[PDB]
Amino acid sequence: FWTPKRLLETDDRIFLVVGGRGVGKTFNVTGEALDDLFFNNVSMVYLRRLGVEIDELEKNNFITEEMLRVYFGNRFSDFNADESKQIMRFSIDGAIHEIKAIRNKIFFDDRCIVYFIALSRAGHVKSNNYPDVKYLVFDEVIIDRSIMPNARYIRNEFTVLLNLIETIKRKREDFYLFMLSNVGENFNPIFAGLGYYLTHEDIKKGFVKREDYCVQFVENKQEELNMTDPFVRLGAKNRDFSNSKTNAFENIRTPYFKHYGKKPKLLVKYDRQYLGIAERKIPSGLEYYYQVYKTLDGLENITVFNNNFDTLMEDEVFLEETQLKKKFKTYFELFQQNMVYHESPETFLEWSKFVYALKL
Amino acid sequence: EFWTPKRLLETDDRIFLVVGGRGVGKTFNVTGEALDDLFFNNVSMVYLRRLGVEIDELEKNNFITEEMLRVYFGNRFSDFNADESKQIMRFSIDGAIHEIKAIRNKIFFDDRCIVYFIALSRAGHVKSNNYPDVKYLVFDEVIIDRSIMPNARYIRNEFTVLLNLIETIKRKREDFYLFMLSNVGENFNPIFAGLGYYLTHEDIKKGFVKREDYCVQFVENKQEELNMTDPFVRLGAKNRDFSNSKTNAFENIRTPYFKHYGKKPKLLVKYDRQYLGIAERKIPSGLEYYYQVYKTLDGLENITVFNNNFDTLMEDEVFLEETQLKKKFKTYFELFQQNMVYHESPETFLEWSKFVYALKLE
Amino acid sequence: FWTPKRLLETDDRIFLVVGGRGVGKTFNVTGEALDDLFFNNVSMVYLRRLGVEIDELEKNNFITEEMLRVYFGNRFSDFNADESKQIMRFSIDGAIHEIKAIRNKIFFDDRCIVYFIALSRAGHVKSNNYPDVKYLVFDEVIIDRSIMPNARYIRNEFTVLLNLIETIKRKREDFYLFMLSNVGENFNPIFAGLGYYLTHEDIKKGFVKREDYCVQFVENKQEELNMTDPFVRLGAKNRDFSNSKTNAFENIRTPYFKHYGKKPKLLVKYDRQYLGIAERKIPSGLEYYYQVYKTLDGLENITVFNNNFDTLMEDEVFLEETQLKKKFKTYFELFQQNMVYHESPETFLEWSKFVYALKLE
Amino acid sequence: FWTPKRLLETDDRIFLVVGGRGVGKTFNVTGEALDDLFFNNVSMVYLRRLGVEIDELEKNNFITEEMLRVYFGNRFSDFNADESKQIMRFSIDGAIHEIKAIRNKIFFDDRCIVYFIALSRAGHVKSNNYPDVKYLVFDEVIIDRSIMPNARYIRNEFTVLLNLIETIKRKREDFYLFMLSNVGENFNPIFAGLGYYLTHEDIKKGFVKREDYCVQFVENKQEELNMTDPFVRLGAKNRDFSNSKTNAFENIRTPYFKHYGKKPKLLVKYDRQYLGIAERKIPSGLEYYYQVYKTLDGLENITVFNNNFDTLMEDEVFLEETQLKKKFKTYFELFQQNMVYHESPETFLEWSKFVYALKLE
Amino acid sequence: SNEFWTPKRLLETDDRIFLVVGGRGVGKTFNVTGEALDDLFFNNVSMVYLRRLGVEIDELEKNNFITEEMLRVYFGNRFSDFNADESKQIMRFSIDGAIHEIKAIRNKIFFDDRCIVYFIALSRAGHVKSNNYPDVKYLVFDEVIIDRSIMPNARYIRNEFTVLLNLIETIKRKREDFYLFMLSNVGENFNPIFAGLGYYLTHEDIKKGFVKREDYCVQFVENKQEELNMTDPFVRLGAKNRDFSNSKTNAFENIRTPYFKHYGKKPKLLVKYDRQYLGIAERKIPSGLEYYYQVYKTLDGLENITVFNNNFDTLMEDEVFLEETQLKKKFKTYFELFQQNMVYHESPETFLEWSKFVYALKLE
């Protein structure tokens, strides 16, 4: 079982809930919000990375009779629904309420309470048609490689995400973000943008608080498997399917960490800092170290490459997008694969922001 | 005509595999028997297809037919009137007024959805979708026919995607039925590997096979006389390729080669409480391959072990990643897919098939 | 000028109409059927080889106001309404009828009477249901190279067609199939599946009767050309346009025929017979002869390839996609081009069925 | 400034209009026809080379309110229109008329008066769907390379056009064809089928008459450019755009002409004549001459290639698409670029008909 | 409120052509479309929304082109009784007590059964040279300059400006009252639109914020410096991500300034273009070779240098005809050298002349 009520008590307005596959995190987040959506004149936005995730989604059953029964209990009554017209009719507290699903929106008493959006299509939703939105739920935020073999994150995904947060949330203090992931691993833009490094010790804690967001890990429910049912036995016989259920933390993609004293081969100035790559000669080949330097101390003659022309100065060489791909592509490949040593987790996150921001 | 799912439903098993009997209207009869439940027992149905086009090209309009309503409800069916332009059917059963409307990928009976159309290719994205009262799931054309379709490929880790859909479509429902309908029956398909069924001519002769979790039935085309007064029938008989198709359900069952090799395998992969090994035996013409299964790592101290799962990875085993499996296991998978390797026994062949299809790439 | 009224009187239920481009073969076949579709509760299916043929087709103009008037004459009236809804409101015998065309269907009084289908997509519609189809029209059955530069027949097209006949036609004695071709030539799967060899002698006769089907040839009507009209004079000056009207039978793709005594290099067992290819060394290079042998007499040690695993036996070599491409790809190309000798037209038809059944693109 | 009243008065029924960019030739031609379409029970067909030219065309605004006012003046009144449903309602002479534009048709009082067709889609259309067509307008008949960078003529375009003329016009003496081109140049299929060789001397006259058609040249008006308007000033500053206005006759693609006595290397029999290519060895390389021979005199042993199997005879070698691409593909390219010598303009037009009829691309 | 950019100041000026660059996320399209509404709704004038590529329009949501907030902002109190049908994508509302409905179908938006907005793609503009647009008063070319960040390899149309000018003629016929709005999120040189206008982008102009020319006016939109609340976590998260923060001020990150130098020696080749002669000079240097792009008003001291003429009509004397096949063989490398900042231009004026020539004849 899982509920958002505990997190909503905390001051933080941003939550990352990872794990607990099949525990209905999306059901519970939507259910707890209902009272606000129905009667506090606030909306919700359901976000997905790709349009296909929403086009194939069954909007009509996003809100269910059972969901209304669980969250409103006895107050819920007189349920009658016309699935053919995507209309739900019921009574709460004796009042008559009707829920209608149209195109990519859900309406409660002729007022939109849920908006369905795809990050791929975020650019066209630049119109501010989101006045009353109080909740944003980004389901399946982290790609599952097991379930999907070749799913790719959006180019500069976090920048696209942050733009959508701003468009939907405008000078609105009362706003909430609920990123939900079935799988938790490192080396994803969402983790880099947040600044969160996933470690087994944090998973053991189960709850993690940070300056701008809160991270929670959900333990998969130990529900018994009925062996009288053949379908349960069939699933148990297939190991790949059975392992999937508990594969949330199968691999967290921990990176290699090592320290190299020697000065770096090259530097790139990004975000008030200089990122450096150091090559160490070893008999087999080369050992790569990725480092961050706060100031250009002891690096007088090392060339500095600047992605941004506006902040370009002194003897730095302007690196254009085509020129940058020519040289840092191999270094980027080394970063994507766990083939380089990182000075510390803090440095690893700075490098991740740069790679994913500029990745092509 | 003669085949009906009434006999299978009498059996306790809730999972059925129906092979053969092409053109016998297996889908038609399965849908008709369910109608009584869908119309009056408040249970929905899901029609499943491997690819979206299989559904996009499907005529949802005629999925339920007037003849179908008449045959299964007989005299109780009356006053049939339909507006095909608006995809609306209006009829009477037992004196009540019922209207069937088909819109997009759903069919509605009296304002209640009774049939859902879904494609396994798009199943992954609908892992959160809700289907309240589904009692029947029908996977038509479960086994690809190479003759009818030249180059159709199974989905990556297809059986896992199917099992996830079973869980999504079926949630805490003891009363559920799954129907797998295949016009062609052959080995070397993921559906057969996931079930654990090895197709053999001996089983086909019996015509009925029962297993712990599922039941398999084979439909033999009736050797019915062909009316020669009709010209269309005569034209088909003259064409051998078309005529063979009628009885080509079991033309080739893709039986694999079996032999035993004593020597130790070249490499090992740890899968499902066991170790799978590949053995290479040098022969003058070229090389010989043997696929074996070892219950324990006894006498295999220094043989390299590949582990698919990082969580259970330990000691000196090599982690199996998409890049690593392609480098080493790409050729071996091709050798397995083609009937180019020796298998210790049919039991081992099924173990290898699950592993190959789970990690196979395309 | 041409209509299928005469053919429908005949007992045969399968007809092949070749030639007569611009004679409204589609119109007359569709017009004569109307009485059945409108009042006899029978549907029609319009078939095309490729989806592209139907996607570009204008379904709403499949039935025209002119069409209704010609076939129903005085009985038809009150056609002055078009509502942009694909609806045509008119009168026959005083009754009010409305024809609505939506997507790939045409509806008459809320009942679908015409279905548009592409043979490429027939495989996916094996489970599709067509309740009351009585007519199937395969228009432009034979590819026109001039009009269409590079159109390719479907793999095992005739088997796909026969399967579609079965799906569209189930337990129906009263069924009609119309194959309409603007051009008639050999070396096409449709002709091979039927068993018809196109010869100039048959075209002059104009009528050919067979066990399972009837073939009729439509000659473009001869007309004096009014030269007072400038448009006619302009056309006469362009030779290509003038040639096009009589180009229906310009080339019938006749193959070379010769008999070679020597034993064949290889044999393939197909359809209760053995097909053999014989290679004869000549100073310039090699000569090819395609032969059929009733029995394996005097061919004891020649290798035999069997396409069907079920009938495979003894020392025959299993024929799979890899094996046939390795050995039969060049032979199939030699067959497609008029580069081999055939024992007789009968043997040529046997080889054509085999090539097209197993050919890959 | 320009109207087709003068051309319609002339006996010729086929007209080619070149030049006069921005003079609203299509607008004015459509307006003059209206009286016939509205009250004389005759339809019109608007033709374009490619489908998008029509798909992107605004059918609703093909006939405009301003156009009705201009052509009917005071008689036009009580205008009310629903653009959302593409319906126009107005009164002419006190009567109530409504124009409905739906799909590829425009309806005037529930009678279609304009049909939109694309030559690419011409194959799909039959003569049944067009009862009373009196006007055919082929706009932008000659491709403009400045506005459209890479538009290609249809294969055997003139034959496709002539077939469409026959389909749209059947046994109709009262028919008119308008070919409208912003730019006029040689080496295009339409000019070749007509038989017209474009020369500057013809342009100066402004009017050219032939047996079957009439050619008129419209020069863009040399009216002063208002510099108070900023948009006009901006266009003048851009020379490429400014040149385009008067670029109708910028380059007429005149061919090179020379005579070579020696006999040709090869001959092809086309349209009751023999076309020959002569190669002359020169120190730099090779020189090409394209010739036409009325009779096979002095060419006894030169090989002759015949495209048409029906006319194939004696020792001529059959020409097929694969074979001709091997030999005539380079020659067609040498012809397309001004790299060959033509005996005379008459021969150039004969060679042009052959090249474009069999050209592939 | 005052923060957002609006074209009220621009409309007061006599100029009818405006170029607006920068101000991403300031609703330039929103405000321009909103101010026009009064004309579109009640002055019987239509609007045309232009985009370079068809995908830009096919993916565009026409239904949200006009929004309730736009109507409420621009009509203020007069706007009331807003009720829209989501199924039909029909908006219904009240202005001044009158009944108005905005319906969007296909590539058109209809106001009270009258089309007020047309969506057109410059790629498809060529074939619509005969199209009729009766009462268009506003033409808006949004995203006129391609953004490399948002779109990785989007190509300008061949001879784009000539295609654009032709579309202006088709949309605007004998209409003195016409307005053209060019909206760009990013501003840079080496683009065809800036070349056709004749505008050279320089940092000094951006600081001024306003630039006036004979036929057009250029304005630069600066993102309003609104303070960022750091108590809100969402704001802090955005500040931590430099890429998101940089994107707001990346309008003028790189203006692609060209290199300029003068070479005395006579040019290797000449092309006669637009009543002038363009010459390319190659200078041998130890490292390799150096390129200079020059313009000569007259053929003085260039007697024997070959001249290439694109236009047959003005071809004369010993000039060599320039044809599509000939130009590709030699000017392909030169066009590439120009596209990259690898050549020296005599001055910004010459660079603009060279840009007109390159893009007119450029191929892709």
Residue numbers in the entry:
A (entry chain B): 8 to 367
B (entry chain C): 7 to 368
C (entry chain D), D (entry chain E): 8 to 368
E (entry chain A): 5 to 368
The authors write:
We present the first atomic-resolution crystal structure of a multimeric ring form of a viral dsDNA packaging motor, the ATPase of the asccφ28 phage, and characterize its atomic-level dynamics via long timescale molecular dynamics simulations. In contrast, a close homolog of the φ29 ATPase from the related bacteriophage asccφ28 (gp11) has been shown to form highly soluble functional rings; extensive analytical ultracentrifugation and small-angle X-ray scattering experiments show that the ATPase forms pentameric rings in solution. Individual subunits within the ring are organized into two globular domains connected by a linker domain, each of which is nearly identical to the corresponding domains of the φ29 gp16. Like φ29 gp16, the N-terminal domain adopts the canonical ASCE ATPase fold, while the C-terminal domain is a ‘vestigial nuclease domain’.
Two crystal forms of gp11 were obtained: (i) tetragonal crystals belonging to space group P43212 and (ii) trigonal crystals belonging to space group P3221. While the three structures described here were determined in the absence of nucleotide, the active sites of ASCE ATPases are well characterized and can be accurately identified. Two distinct conformations of the Walker A motif are apparent in our crystal structures. One conformation binds either a SO42− or PO43− ion in the canonical β-phosphate position. The ion forms hydrogen bonds with the backbone of the Walker A motif in lieu of a β-phosphate, typically provided by ATP or ADP, which explains why the Walker A backbone adopts a conformation similar to a typical nucleotide-bound ATPase configuration. However, because the structure was solved in absence of nucleotide or nucleotide analog, it lacks any interactions mediated by the α- and γ-phosphates, ribose sugar, or adenosine base. Thus, this structure likely represents a conformation with mixed characteristics from both the apo and nucleotide-bound configurations. However, the crystal structure of asccφ28 gp11 ring reported here shows no such helicity in the N- or C-terminal domains. We suspect that we do not observe helicity in the crystal structures due to lack of substrate DNA imparting helicity.
